[model samples]
Target: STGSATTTPIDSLDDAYITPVQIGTPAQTLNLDFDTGSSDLWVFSSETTASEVDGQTIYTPSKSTTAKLLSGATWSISYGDGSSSSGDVYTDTVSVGGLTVTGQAVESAKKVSSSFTEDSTIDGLLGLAFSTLNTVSPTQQKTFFDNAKASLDSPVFTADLGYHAPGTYNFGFIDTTAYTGSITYTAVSTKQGFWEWTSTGYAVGSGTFKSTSIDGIADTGTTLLYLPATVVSAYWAQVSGAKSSSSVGGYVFPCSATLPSFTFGVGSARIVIPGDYIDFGPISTGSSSCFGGIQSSAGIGINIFGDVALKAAFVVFNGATTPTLGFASK
Candidate 1:
């Protein structure tokens, strides 16, 4: 039978979404962040410094009956946001939903960036990206998706995300009922180890829908939607006080500024992002300040269609041959 798992948003921040995961014998449950942007199953573990790990649960491989050390194996990974981690490796039985993969490489974090150390809720990240992105050294590891693909009736998965609500990440099948209308399929180029694709174009508000191609990856792991500097400027220009602040991270605007809805083209169909979704909460607590969730994809060579963008549609990650991304209104 095929497998599927539901992802629950941490009520506190729509930024991170977690799914229930079981590892090794007796089933140690870990609320892992299901990330499509990266491919590494590294978790907070006993190997991490006690002082460094805040309230997050740690996985203990030695306590598991099926756990085995991948001797001398190690992994290190960094994020565009500067968060980084490095660790040792262990092999264990890993399960998501009802799907199980034996002898899966589980990286145990020995060190974590303060951002990770401060997150008390997340235990780790379950990467849905391809195995080529796995960071395991001496012998690269396969991702859970890759390891479990063969057993599936169809090598496909669907991400049905909601606005601050629980969503399911399906495996081996696509449920047509979860989405509305027809899913417009867009060709994907995986040369970059991602479900990369090009958009025909996009528009801001009720304005004329511009037709300029944008290159980006559909990333469920990232919190906000990032676009080209010029495109971001176009949207923010309508907001009176909006300014691109390198010091404040990206673009900041008056909290009360009335913002317009943002829209993007997915193949022939157009996906609209609500205006309120743009104000990503206050830049600082209660200061009449806010930052836009739609910001410049600076430094990073490609833009990212992140959670803010993904939550706006029903997404299908086609894994049959060459990757294709399917989208429809949820």
Candidate 2:
């Protein structure tokens, strides 16, 4: 059967989208961040050390009558952002909203790093990446979507990440009522275990759209948009008193400086991000300085269309034969 879920924003920050996921029999529900950047559905569990769990809830397989152990199998993953968890494996019924997948692998965490402990709002992550990125050694794991796809009317899911507001993640079908106008589709390359794509170019406001090609990943777990240093420089150049400062970190500008809207060329459709979204937050020490939400992707070697960009549009993660990404404004 198909399923759908409502996403809640974490605290006041428009960081990650958390959804309720029921694991095991009798359904012990946990709030998991639906992350597209990494693959691995790991949760803080009874197996985790008491000290490492912080304020987060843990999953208890023993409490479920239908929970089955995968023998000596194990899982460990240290994400790019230092968010990590590792533990044993258990197969049981997994449910999302109304969708249920039997015998889905549920990784229970025995340990979590400090980064995870600090952000205790989310109990764990529900990875949406390809199964190739699954961290379970010896035997790869399948994501909740993967296990449920066969029963779905359509092998696709849609992400509507709102700005500091509740959004919905629809599985098996798209809700035409949730988006405006028509959807623009693009080809996706999953060779790197990500929703990677190339944009024709970008432009500052309604100005000229150049031919600079940008290779990037559409990541929901990431907070800001990351592009090449040159692109970041080009956009910030339009704002007066803006500069790339190592101390301020990436691009910073006067809090009152006027910024331009940035747009990414997606085939014939231009996905736009308003200027206000680029004003990330206040700069450290100085109250008048602010960090640019669109930062340099040079270190990562790839741009990331994180929440800052994704929230501005409705996204369709279609796993059709060719695998494509569809974008539209809501």
Candidate 3:
């Protein structure tokens, strides 16, 4: 079985992409953020606190005949900034695009953070990271991809995220037409429960490629690219007037600055991010200084190639028991 889902950015900043997912019988559909950074297929549900419901859709287990509570099962997860959620677990029919997986774990949120509640566009998150990272305790569960892989034409999925536009997430098989210049494949270490890989090097604009192997995770859940402080400083230095500001947060530069493109090596392939993509958005409405899309991972522990980097190329998460990641020019 194979599946294809159209995912759209919820905001102009391409903060996160949302895809419609059907859960349980009678098909209660909700928009979910497909996150490759964590593992927890959770959702807003009838059990969620009213204060946290906001305007988002909620899944009602009582309405679905196939829904069965996973007795004693519970899950919880927290974000870097202290936002978190926790809930009970259930197994029900879940579908993405046209592909269906029965008895898929669907966590029903009992408690949610203000940040998650404030985001009216996203009802919940569909975790795509390895099942090893699943938050479910007592009895862990598998992710959608993990459950569907055995029936898929191939045990893989691809992400073609667009900047401020609708992109695609295909499961089971790679769509050759979605990319160009051929995909360069590299081994990925799943011990970290992420689509983690090391890039050969990177370059600022047309500068020579620096022979620095940087280990980072390809996380669609994260909105910006975060690299080592040295690499981030190097890229920002190329722009005159760009400076780091603790008040404004991260790096910012004049809106009219002549930005240089960023390039990173995926084996022998050189994937370049357009200069315009690096100019995130204005610090404030009508402000002269703009926030940068790339930032330093000084406090993040590990470097992250988030949407800012993933949008520059077509990425493949190949997990046919043996994991490997593929990158290609678009």
Candidate 4:
């Protein structure tokens, strides 16, 4: 979402999924997903046919006087989920919060799948997760943060997942005063693309797991928190009514009570994901309930800290200086 307007509550759940950040002076809203796996900002264009896209919000450039399209160039993106979109390039005045960034590179999908075309809720994805995955050539590509850094009141941008209640995800400036004095910082590996890290330990209700010593990565592209099976089962044991519900492919517990706190130790920094996240809504099959906190990613090799964990704290990704990840409060 690109605009200078105040953060507005997106009514639909899909809209909430790819939270749109306001950009531009008049405020052209663009829905953005903080994807760590890939880089670049993409949005459905006004020229997209209804049949080509699905479950996506389209943006009309005609509405913005500041919009500009890159002539004679086309782009295509294929996701790990097998869904893809192809389109032309366009330049527009983008803004977030009160900061306005002009001539920002963006993709205007001319042809999209039904999954993206059917939905009228989301406009596009603003990728702030990493720079390596960016689609634009490094010489031309610029991140929203890179442009807003000089103009922002604070040099930092924070993501508050807002899993509980009406969550507010803010960018451009971070309010350090809201934190509990200590903010944890993690070093970023010099590996190519993606924001990767090492996990120090995993504990549920004071019980630790075997694979707790491995390094981990936090990703927003994924929907759930992926952990080892032994670790998941051990963590589930701590929940009062936690039970595996095969229908949902995870564990589910009663929502009536406050869930325990599960902490993942990353070096000296300890990040805690509250129990409310572990207890998710159940799926059709009664055997496996959706475990809010952690679940078994049996065949999946790497462990990811999904939205369930990201929504809890303020996350900052600094690529300018050796690439680092930091956690701060609202």
Candidate 5:
């Protein structure tokens, strides 16, 4: 029964894009980034007069006939990227695909920083990775999956990362017709929060790696793979004749010919990184670009497996029935 599902080839962009669950009755549309790494749905609104609110898509209550603002609840969120926004809470009827959820909680920012105000495409973000980060009030609250689950035809939901664009996030009943062979389902651990895995070691350019096991979390919120410092340095050591270049980043090497292939083991799942990932452009103050997949975070105590790794597998975030994660092939 586990292998009965078929494979359907959906666009990569649509797979990664999760439709926003707008607030208010007959909710207005909002495109949000579905991040599993954090909880809370934050949106720019017309009520916000912060200079950073410029250029970003702001939801106007006057524009939406169905919009409704919350009476007293206030919200503020700061991201690891140093960008933050604050606003009030509101209730609205949200929908994703054909599913409609009522009384969904939404955060409307009245003040946002310049970084957030510059992005017109990024209107809001919705966290769907897990339930531990849920901040919905008990009196009037609901999650995207909570209301859509009962109406789904199946017991599982699948997110195809490559369906639309790199950041496009999609949600719906797992379509069994999307895979070719047998689908492998890994038993999820009750570890909570973002889905985390214990990595065995790192391999560079198909060469053997030192036996240094590392544990980290898989997050959809982050854009790149953030690896441990010692582990990353070990990986760079394997690059034959690799010279560091300042254009890409401090850690980036120009020896494309000697670029090494990196791989990390998650239990039995071995995720491999292509050579190009090591040539990431520079983003640091010293013009030193590190490997795109492996960057130095000093000692953050945790590594993040971001979109670069997630696109390789079919990941299911099961928040409705069992509060578990399911992995399969697309």
Candidate 6:
């Protein structure tokens, strides 16, 4: 079996993408962030504090006849940004796109940090990362993709994210029509439970391609593309008046400056991100300074090829016993 789902950017900045998911027998649909950076399928629920619910939708397990409590089960997750959430667990029928998983673990949030409470658009998160990163305790739970893989025609999924446009997440099979040319396959290190891989080299605009190995995770959850300080510096140096400013957040340059495109190599295949994509809107309302979509990963420890880069190409997550990743220009 195969399944496909549509994901749309939550805002104009394309900060995050949300896909509709159906939960329970009556099919209550909620918009969820299909995040690959973390493995915890959690949602705001009846258990969450009223103040934290804000205007976001909440899951009510009691209303779902198929819902069952996962006795003694609990989960807690914290991100690098310090945002955290924790809660009890429930097993219920969950569906994404056209794929359905019975008895899927659904973490019901009893507490959520301010950052999550403030985001009124997203109702919850549907994790697509390896289940090894799952935060559930006592007995780790499988991610939705993990449970559905066995029934799928093939154990794989693809991400086709677009800039300020709707995208598709296809499971079990790759859509040949979605991409151009052949895909470049690369070895993935799942030791960290991430789709971690290394790029052979990178080039700043049309400049020479640096023969350097840059290891990073292809994270759909992250908003911007983060690379080594040296690489980021090299890229920004091409832009006039570009400088790192704490107040403006990372690298910012004059809005009128001519931006250069970025290119990274997956083996011999080169994927190029248009210069306009790097102009990440203005630093402030009505400001003449704009933030660069490419930022330094110095603080995060590991480099991340987030939405900024992922949106420029087609990504395939092969969920084989020995997982691998594939990238192709779109």
Model number with the top lDDT: 3
The global Cα lDDT (0 to 1) of model 1 is 0.88
Ten contiguous residues with the weakest lDDT in model 2:
277-286
Point out the higher-scoring one by TM-score: 3 or 5: 3
lDDT of 3: 0.93
Superposed model 6: Cα runs more than 4 Å off:
none
Query: Any idea what lDDT model 2 has?
Result: 0.87
Question: Can you write out model 6's per-residue Cα lDDT over 1-330, one digit (the tens) per residue?
Answer: 888999999999899999999998788788999988988999999999998889988899999999999999999999867899999999999988888999999999999999999999899998989999999999999999999999999999999998989999999999999999999999999989999999998999989999899999989989899999999999999998999999866999999998999999898889999988888888879999998999999979999999999999999999998899999999
Sort the predicted structures by lDDT, highest score first: 3, 6, 1, 2, 4, 5
Candidate 2 per-residue C-alpha lDDT over 13-47 given as tens digits, one digit per residue, 9 for 90 to 100? 67677899998878899999998888888888998
Give me the displacement of residue 322 in model 3, in angstroms.
1.4
TM-score of each: 0.97, 0.95, 0.98, 0.79, 0.76, 0.98
Query: After superposition, which runs of candidate 1 have C-alpha atoms over 4 Å from their true positions?
Result: none
Ten-residue region with minimum lDDT total, candidate 1: 8-17
- Badly placed stretches (over 4 Å) of model 4 are 1-18, 22-27, 52-57, 80-82, 117-120, 136-140, 150-155, 170-172, 208-211, 237-260, 285-293, 328-330
Q: Can you write out model 3's per-residue Cα lDDT over 25-93, one digit (the tens) per residue?
A: 899999999999988899999999998889999999999999999999999999755789999999999
Q: What is the C-alpha lDDT of each candidate?
A: 0.88, 0.87, 0.93, 0.62, 0.58, 0.92
lDDT, candidate 4, 1-330, per-residue tens: 222322232342212355555543356666766566566677876777666656555667777777776666566667644666767766778765545678876777777666555555656666665555556532446666666666665555555566644444455455565456466778777474666777777667655533456555667656567777777777777667777777655667665546677777756766777776665554434534334656777766677777667766667655545667777544
lDDT of residue 316 for candidate 1: 91
Q: In lDDT terms, how accurate is model 5?
A: 0.58
**Could you list the CA RMSD of all candidates, in the order they appear?**
1.2, 1.6, 0.9, 4.2, 5.5, 0.9
Give the per-residue lDDT digits (tens) of candidate 1, residues 28-49: 9999988889999989998998
Q: What is the lDDT of residue 284 in candidate 5?
A: 47
Mind giving the per-residue lDDT tens digits that candidate 5 earns over 1-330?
Answer: 111111222232222243444555445666666677766777777778856665556666666656666776776667767877777777666665545666667777778777667755567777654545555444333445544556655545565455224422334556556544444444444365566655667676667755566666667666567787776677666665443345655355533344666776644555566655445443444544334455665555567776655655566666544455555445
